[PDB]
From a paper:
Ferredoxins are small iron–sulfur proteins and key players in essential metabolic pathways. For catalysis, CYPs required electrons typically supplied by redox proteins, such as ferredoxins. Interestingly, two Mtb 3Fe–4S ferredoxins, Fdx and FdxE, are co-located in respective operons with cytochrome [name] (CYP) enzymes suggesting their functional relevance. Here, we explored the genome context for two ferredoxins, Fdx and FdxE, determined the binding kinetics between FdxE and CYP143, and solved three crystal structures: Fdx, CYP143, and a complex FdxE–CYP143.
To obtain a structural insight into a single 3Fe–4S type of ferredoxin, we determined a crystal structure of Fdx at 2 Å resolution. The observed overall fold is typical for the monocluster ferredoxins with two double-stranded antiparallel β-sheets and two α-helices. The structure contains four reverse turns: A, B, C, and E. Turn D is not evident in Fdx forming a loop. Turn C (residues 29–33) forms a rather noticeable protrusion from the surface of the protein. The protruding turn is adjacent to the iron–sulfur cluster and considered to be important in specific interactions with ET partners (discussed as follows). The [3Fe–4S] cluster is bound by cysteine residues 12, 18, and 56. The His15 residue does not form a hydrogen bond to S2 of the [3Fe–4S] cluster (distance of 3.6 Å); its side chain is turned away. Two main differences are the absence of turn D in Fdx and the position of turn C. In the Fdx structure, turn C is additionally stabilized by the interactions with turn A residues: backbone Val34 with Arg9 and Gln33 with backbone Cys12.
Numbering used by the authors: 2 to 66
């Protein structure tokens, strides 16, 4: 039970999140990051932390619900 949060004022479009977890983050060429699942399964928490770590602006975050 967690939610993937994106500080959209901080996303500069590096698209490192899509390279680390492509199933859960998609970045349009002309758009910022799009969170495909806001409430992903518990098995996906590992690959999503990769995207949180790999964001140079730290726009992504995991919030426990
Ligand atoms: S800048 Fe944006 S495109 Fe992803 S790697 Fe960080 S949330
Ligand atoms: Fe890992």
């Amino acid at each position: 039970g967690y939610r993937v949060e994106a500080d959209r004022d901080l996303c500069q479009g590096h698209a490192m999140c899509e390279l680390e977890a492509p199933e859960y983050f998609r970045v349009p060429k002309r758009g910022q990051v799009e969170i495909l699942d806001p409430e992903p399964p518990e098995e996906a928490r590992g690959v999503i932390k990769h995207a949180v770590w790999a964001c140079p602006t730290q726009a992504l975050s995991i919030r426990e619900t």
